[PDB]
Symmetry: D2
Subunit: 237 residues, 4 copies
Amino acid sequence: ADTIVAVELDTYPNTDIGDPSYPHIGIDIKSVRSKKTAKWNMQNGKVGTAHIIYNSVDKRLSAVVSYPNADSATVSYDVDLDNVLPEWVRVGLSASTGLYKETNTILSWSFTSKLKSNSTHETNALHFMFNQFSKDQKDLILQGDATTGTDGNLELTRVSSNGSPQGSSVGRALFYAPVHIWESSAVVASFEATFTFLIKSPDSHPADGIAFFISNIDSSIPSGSTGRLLGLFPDAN
Amino acid sequence: ADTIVAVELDTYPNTDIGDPSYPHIGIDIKSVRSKKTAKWNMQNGKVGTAHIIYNSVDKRLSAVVSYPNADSATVSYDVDLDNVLPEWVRVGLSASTGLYKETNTILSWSFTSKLKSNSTHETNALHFMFNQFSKDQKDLILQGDATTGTDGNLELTRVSSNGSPQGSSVGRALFYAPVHIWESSAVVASFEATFTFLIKSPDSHPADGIAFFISNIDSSIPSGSTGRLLGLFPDAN
Amino acid sequence: ADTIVAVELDTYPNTDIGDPSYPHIGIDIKSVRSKKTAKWNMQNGKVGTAHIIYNSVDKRLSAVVSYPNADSATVSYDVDLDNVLPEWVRVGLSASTGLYKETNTILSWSFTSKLKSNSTHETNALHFMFNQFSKDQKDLILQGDATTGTDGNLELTRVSSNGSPQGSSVGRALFYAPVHIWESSAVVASFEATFTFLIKSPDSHPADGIAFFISNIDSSIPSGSTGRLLGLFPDAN
Amino acid sequence: ADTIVAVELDTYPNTDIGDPSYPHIGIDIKSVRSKKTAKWNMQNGKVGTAHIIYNSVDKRLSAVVSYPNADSATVSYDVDLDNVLPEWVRVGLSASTGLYKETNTILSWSFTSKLKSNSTHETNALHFMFNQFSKDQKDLILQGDATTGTDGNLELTRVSSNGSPQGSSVGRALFYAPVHIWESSAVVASFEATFTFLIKSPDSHPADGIAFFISNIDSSIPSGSTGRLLGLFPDAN
Ligand SMILES: [Ca+2]
Ligand SMILES: [Ca+2]
Ligand SMILES: [Ca+2]
Ligand SMILES: [Ca+2]
Ligand SMILES: [Cl-]
Ligand SMILES: [Cl-]
Ligand SMILES: [Cl-]
Ligand SMILES: [Cl-]
Ligand SMILES: [Cl-]
Ligand SMILES: [Cl-]
Ligand SMILES: [Cl-]
Ligand SMILES: [Cl-]
Ligand SMILES: [Mn+2]
Ligand SMILES: [Mn+2]
Ligand SMILES: [Mn+2]
Ligand SMILES: [Mn+2]
Ligand code: NA
Ligand code: NA
Ligand code: NA
Ligand code: NA
């Protein structure tokens, strides 16, 4: 199986797998059963922004999600990712629907990783920023139902031509290049990601959510990972 | 009195004010008596690099110092700087000598502060990077004995024309513009600084050290802050 | 008198000072009579974005202005700014109204200047980015009628509480720190600026425009520089 | 055949293919016979730095090369790269030796490409920075004789364990991800690259040089491109 570290924006409460009884943001370390969660007052049909941060000195994976005119939600978990993830990874976004559904539209996505060594010329960095997505976005690996280019956006899950989200959908987008997240000479290592999203559902109960994730380089959508599994995990263990 | 948050590279052990019995790096919150320290294997005459990091989600002020071919030293302290510092600050470097002495030469200095709001256009930022210093560096406020331009460097404390550091010296350099470190709409705030330095002494016992500091905007060198007080504090309380 | 280099977004045609008979963008080198102009299909009440670019290798000052869903306008002028501007400058935004009027609202403003030397550690940089403006924006020098904080924006010229722009207004905002634009060791020097703006008028004929400008450090609004002079020049010479 | 745009640091004068009678820097558009050249006072065994710049408004490909304590060399050529290169490219470094030889050592390499659209959220960017190279640098495609990790450097051409450069060698390194260099909505597009290099030869006549290049995504070393062809071209046409 793949190795997954993720921040979930979980829109549907599956209480038998540890979700609280409301939409929430969570830190997922190798399991869909979040290590830490916080209540998320998700707004159907509104554009929100998520920020994810981590550094090797503090060893705390943190996330903040907000909408204009609203308070933020935040969640943090103390974890040494050097002990979870391999030295080289890919980074991505994932989303799913199940018997309940929503659009999982990404309007923008940025990422920066840095490794500062003890040499006088210390800094290695990777940065990418998408504020629009082309019909042929060659620097993204699209998996499952994910598509790019419709209204300049990344649609992680299936949407019909009239905007209607489809159930039982899963899709991911990964940046094309492998990312160096640990190095033997690095004295400070850090990563951050930001994405803006539009989750809209014609229903009172949207599902299932969007995640930012970091994985082994050859990661692929696990079998049967629609719905509550967010395209990230093969089961709910 | 001024309000000071600082990371000290303390080259001389003053044990009656809480210094350990060796050169060390420390986190100073409104006092020269560091809240946290770590042993620092300072290398007389070698160019080193210091990194300082903080963000408002984790509320941990951390620093790493290293030399090429050597292990790093690191120190961290949990502190909500929103409860210490004002909303607007200046940032700077400070150094001192006393009856023992050293050069306090800065070869480069960079700083980045960011405030990300809950608006869709979220980011405010300030960044500066000096890899050399002019004889007339108009975007730096020089205090005390600090000078710029000699060999393209910033000399925080007095050095003679032949390279000899002078005792009983104190000097600081602050970036000209005020820096916005907290804002009511910010959902993520962060700062980082890096500087490279050359501390050299003709003596077996160098003193007193270099600090990166954040202060009220009108901060000035306190009276009698040579030596163990690092140009930062009026006393050892 | 001050020394001014500016890119003008000129909303009102003053044909006796060389304006074409339509709104236009122009490169102004020490005179309001632009050295080069291009037609600008200004859209009353819509948010637009302007980009300004220059580097010391190509010695060409260029600007691009656009609105969503519209083609851009662009203008360029070959000029060695080393022969116009001093070594240290301030950078700013300026706007005016006269007997005709408009809002001159700035929603965001960013700037980056770089000096790369022939040393192995080559880069000096200054960068600032405002995507919102506080009621007390301490890193901006506000001149004339300019204010910050209303709806998080920078209003360069006077607007009443109900949104009504006032005539005979002039105002500027300059970044607090001096900016190093030329240095003897620099092998590549460059600057860029971007700003987003909302020019709205209740009238069919808005006036007078907005400019991004670079000036001597002590620059101030010239006397009688309302209207066609854009807050930049004391006369139309 | 591949499509190549390159900046050459040409260490050996091949006068029958248009080289001047000295080491030189050149702009190569689809041919090793540079469209523009400038004299380059190459220093055997010294670390130098090259900068390459281009933007879609000015349509001028420019390069600057320097060593510490020395004047720079610069070359520029007016060319609309939209008419040369495809929309998506890869970027890389190339070097060669022939019957004359040199080390072609890369100590650092950075690249930034930006596409700014007419949307209010305008910016797309890719940036990478290597100040060291790992024995397994997964985000680089190494071609021919190129290797990474020896002393933390990228060796484009073959070097023995004792530092001796080998003749008849060719090697390239390309960034793993495709790069978007033109887009239909982009109102400003730009790229820049910097690399630091050490060319050393035990001989009075080093050869053949190093190039920064942009190519079709599937570019590969052409047959027989050792020596004067710099790993870039299949012939001298
Ligand atoms: Ca769930
Ligand atoms: Ca001490
Ligand atoms: Ca006019
Ligand atoms: Ca040649
Ligand atoms: Cl939210
Ligand atoms: Cl529900
Ligand atoms: Cl150290
Ligand atoms: Cl001692
Ligand atoms: Cl426009
Ligand atoms: Cl008119
Ligand atoms: Cl050179
Ligand atoms: Cl020769
Ligand atoms: Mn959950
Ligand atoms: Mn101490
Ligand atoms: Mn005009
Ligand atoms: Mn040549
Ligand atoms: Na939403
Ligand atoms: Na030292
Ligand atoms: Na407008
Ligand atoms: Na060389």
